[PDB]
Design a protein around this ligand. Structure first.
Ligand SMILES: Nc1ncnc2c1ncn2[C@@H]1O[C@H](COP(=O)(O)OP(=O)(O)NP(=O)(O)O)[C@@H](O)[C@H]1O
Ligand SMILES: [Mg+2]
Lengths: 86, 202
């Protein structure tokens, strides 16, 4: 319902195999059992790299928080490299 | 060609050139060089080999469909029958003769019994079939592009082993095909995503 979106969210399961391409996610901020940070969606989950990200500053980012995320999906490590988070 | 088949670009290129085969040569003493292009697709299951045969069957001006088990060697070349109109022994054209100046499609080609494949050789080598039975001693024209589909001796292609060990057919038959294509359903997320979304659109 927010005007900024009506780019648009792709559910996480849509990413799989869509290599090296920009996407916007909405997801539950998990920490996977393997230890890596991750996002989850009703359709699935994906591990994320935050090492180059820029969050918006007016927020906390605790686990389990619903976060909008922009990034590039990379199939080689099955990672999602996060541009920014909000 | 075959817009409902993803990928297989080099095969569709070869199919196009096979629909448009090169000029046949005739030389001294009536010596002959064939102009058909003979294609064998051998490979993993579910790699559109049969669908490509069915597209060719729907696209060539003159195409005859066959399948390995369903084809007799006699049913392929020509068969003797009595013409009940008169009572005389007469030849009935088989698939290779009916496809003359056309193409033949063969699905499940490696499933043929070898007394069927023994009858393939003259069509490939000489574009003709020879009859020497029932007091009928003749030679018939069978000038056509064979395109065939097969699987390896194992259910899928085994890259650990040589083509002559993967492929059931004799080298005395494989050497007669113009292009021997090996295809595989080799798993890859990007290609699987692409082929999948194409097939869903289809
Ligand atoms: N690249 C492709 N694009 C679209 N559909 C495909 C593709 N590859 C396979 N298929 C589908 O797979 C199904 C089986 O195709 P088919 O031509 O019978 O495979 P095949 O190579 O002959 N397998 P087999 O007869 O067991 O050796 C068909 O419904 C095709 O539509
Ligand atoms: Mg087949």
């Amino acid at each position: 319902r927010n005007e900024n979106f009506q780019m648009s969210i792709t559910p996480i399961k849509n990413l799989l195999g869509r290599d090296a391409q920009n996407f916007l996610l909405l997801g539950l901020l998990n920490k996977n059992f393997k230890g890596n940070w991750s996002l989850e969606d009703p359709s699935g989950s994906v591990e994320i790299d935050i090492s180059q990200t820029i969050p918006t500053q007016g927020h906390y980012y605790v686990p389990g928080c619903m976060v909008l995320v922009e990034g590039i999906y990379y199939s080689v490590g099955n990672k999602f490299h996060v541009t920014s988070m909000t | 060609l075959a817009p409902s088949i993803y990928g297989h670009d080099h095969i569709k290129k070869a199919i196009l050139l096979m629909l448009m085969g090169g000029v046949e040569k005739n030389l001294e003493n009536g010596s002959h060089l064939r102009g058909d292009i003979n294609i064998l697709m051998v490979g993993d299951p579910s790699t559109a080999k049969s669908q490509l045969l069915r597209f060719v069957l729907n696209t060539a001006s003159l195409a005859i469909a066959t399948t390995g088990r369903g084809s007799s060697g006699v049913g392929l070349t020509a068969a003797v029958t009595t013409d009940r109109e008169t009572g005389e022994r007469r030849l009935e054209a088989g698939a290779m003769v009916l496809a003359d100046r056309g193409v033949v499609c063969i699905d499940e080609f490696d499933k043929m019994t070898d007394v069927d494949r023994v009858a393939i050789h003259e069509v490939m080598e000489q574009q003709t079939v020879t009859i020497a039975k029932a007091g009928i001693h003749t030679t018939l024209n069978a000038r056509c592009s064979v395109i065939a589909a097969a699987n390896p001796v194992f259910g899928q292609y085994d890259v650990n082993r040589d083509p002559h060990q993967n492929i059931a057919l004799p080298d005395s038959l494989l050497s007669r095909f113009d292009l021997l294509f090996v295809v595989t359903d080799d798993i890859n997320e990007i290609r699987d995503r692409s082929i999948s979304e194409h097939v869903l659109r289809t």
